[PDB]
């Protein structure tokens, strides 16, 4: 009697649910409204902890991991990202790895830091970093910074610096971001008021990338002068950053 | 007999189920196996089926479901008692995400669920707040989220509990 | 009277079908269940004899040309191959002809047999052979063998050796296979217990293939040692094969 | 009048038809022209329309349909008599595939169809087993298959033949 | 309902079975899955379960069972109709051995079984001579033998058929 | 009506079997007596066609593949071979491969034909041939002959010549024989009135065999003179044998 209760208040319903199956279906389907629609997080935050319908929101109000289906900022973009065809999206950035001319923002970062072909070889060696940039461009005005990974084998890590003081990564966008960068860890940070996603290796069908051919195209291209200086200032600001392992 | 009910419960979603239990003497072995193929986004009503297993048994028990990544689909293994060594998710009511790599597994029993429910200040009144598993199968991983779900109209749920209370 | 019958048993129905049009529609649409769902075949078997909804099944139980809509093995894969967009599928293997890095199984066959650039020139000269491999990979662990065609002008033929003792080509897969390889004859054979599809020329929008650039990429790539030895054993087993014209 | 019936018969599918016949004196010229555009997978009920032409004529005949690849669509040409030189498919009941290159053609008459039907041990009872052409238009070729099709429910077909037998 | 009967039929042996069928409209998909682990020597009563499936259906059919080597156990897949391409053992009544390598499969339908039974001069009288599969699981292979088995006492079987004939 | 019958004589029983489950169990278990207890075969006969309970019988009366459970010759030996523990039996001939001193009949064949160490190296290279001899010795007075395989890569085949004009291989014995020699084909032949099992390769945990140490032991051993001469006569009789592939 003392161990039994406790609480035995479900027993009347389950007797009734056996007799009434058409009620049992509507009761189960009825339980659709989630009680917690957004929850706070702290930086540094591993994006791998977010599931397919989670969106990230970073601001002065705080950092939040919300449900996409109840999020107004996700709803506004939901018609724009409505296709969501991953067979085409995986083939898209695989195809766009071949031609990197339009993507000034990506190459400019290399041009500003170290404009040699050996630096361009080291960047093109990790094609998942371009995929990260391609995904985050679509769903706009991000900046990329390549640094050396001091707590790993001789390979580089990318910082994705956001322009605005308020940031919102759509659920479909970070679903694509995490899928495209399998074998890279993505963590969200803040540094000198700038939100930033560090993309480094943690532990694939890609075309063979000609480092010399793009290096030839680099000389023909005329970059925006104010964008290259921006990178030099941004590289200077992120030198003492030291993101934890 | 329970599988008939379990299929009815999951008939709204697209989760495949696999086809005896004694109410006086409930078995320690696996009772049901729900499967969910790659690409799907279906929801498993965990708290409902756990509390369904408690009512099914006339002897005291602590029902448990095990969620596993086979490396192709998701697997939900039903039990009346949590087996020795079987895993439990450390999740809270607000922080409830669990990612599973290939062959890895987690689970949840009714007793550990009650601890989480009381610790989060969640409404214990019948069918007002019910834990359910949102699962997304993004190969090679399986993404799980142990979210509490309430009804769209609470006044409808309260009148249903009166209909059950009437027939008694 | 003697020539007349014979048999005149349809006449009552057609008189009735004139009076009742709504019955005539349901009777015609009603005739939907095909009496023969699968039929046996013998090897060598020309795959050109199979129509768009036919599937091929090869095993110890025998060789069968089945209807896809009544086939359980076809039904299981029907959600996976559900898009079936040929505009994108024709453009897919045309685009993937440019980048051959991921496709180790295809290149390894060339590497094992004859790793020169002249051998790679002769392979890349017939791009429909890669298309055949690309189609049969999607719908998995096949092996390809390039031999010289002794009953034709100086050009090579491909054998597609299946791994398992049971084989099943989906109806959509061999529809794509035959469409992609227009100007090549595909015939199914068996040799030393291994089922094999011989793809040779019988009697197009493709990119210009740089044989030297892929040959450069070949040296950078590190093949699986056990896969190259496998090919050497497989080439040794298929030397005395002699597939008929 | 026959084209009205032929359009009704093909109304379930997506095969275009083109718009007089004397029952006592049937013409040797082409009676109908059914067209099927590139990409389509529609089915032509051959045995039905052939036996429909036999009932239409009060003088003895041997109805015939010619299937041709125009090099853009498929063409079915109707006839009451098989013209001189017109092709017949050598197919059996089990092996029934015919591929057509551009401008090439095949065909089937009621008499040659009866030979195939009896040779394959097929059920001759009315509407129990009926030859139909499954056509797939994969340019530049036209893929044909002369398959026998039965009803999903035979008990329904047997009761329909009684309804016709009643009104006589 | 059929699985209840199939488990009862196999209850004497040690062959695991896996847990709906409409008598008017029988499904083309797999109906049952019997499994037999490595080391076992159990016997599957093929002709019995095949003729059990024929009586179960009120529409004409040709029941079929598929025997496969998974590469760990033996698999018997039940069907009401033999699927397209599915294998049939070429065995006779006297020469009836079939060895299966890993993933390879054979099978037997009621119609092909009747051909073998009549061709071997075997007694067609009910339950006097019944084909059964003796299977030995010697990994990596599966050894099968399609042997006809009669009763130890025929006078007992004849009196049982009178008991059935009485209740009619 | 005409297609229906045919024959519909099982329907009364199955109606009754539904009502009476306890009869259905006894009816199924009742069907235990096999109608064909032995069946004739012809040589050459591949032993791989025999299942676990089949026994082979060779004599002037003919060649027969019988069921062990109904065979009197199998029944007599069934208490002697009653353990049947394959875990110990696989470990037995694996252990006995180390020490080959007692087995004069096996080594004498090598000694008589070619008594060098290189011949002993070629024999010990194929340890499944000893396993074949070990199994067939237990369940008695066989003789072994090693010849070169002319329709395969440079490796040898063994003939197992039986002494008597009547021969009977127990079902457990040939179950063990086939299991122990996985990767070798065993076929039964007759040559100049002598029944013989040819054991050759068709297409494993074994100890490393020291050819020099056994060759040293060979010189110390004193063979039976009449057994070595027997082998010389037997090798002379089997020279023009030519067993088919
Ligand atoms: Cl980081
Ligand atoms: Cl060929
Ligand atoms: Cl031999
Ligand atoms: Zn959002
Ligand atoms: Zn198929
Ligand atoms: Zn015996």
Author numbering:
A (entry chain 26), C (entry chain 1A), F (entry chain 1K): 19 to 157, 160 to 223, 229 to 270
B (entry chain 27), D (entry chain 1B), E (entry chain 1L): 4 to 22, 26 to 174
From the paper:
Although nucleo-cytoplasmic transport is typically mediated through nuclear pore complexes, herpesvirus capsids exit the nucleus via a unique vesicular pathway. Together, the conserved herpesvirus proteins pUL31 and pUL34 form the heterodimeric nuclear egress complex (NEC), which, in turn, mediates the formation of tight-fitting membrane vesicles around capsids at the inner nuclear membrane. In the nucleus of infected cells, pUL34 recruits pUL31 to the inner nuclear membrane to form the nuclear egress complex (NEC). Thus, the NEC represents self-sufficient machinery that can mediate inwardly directed vesicle formation.
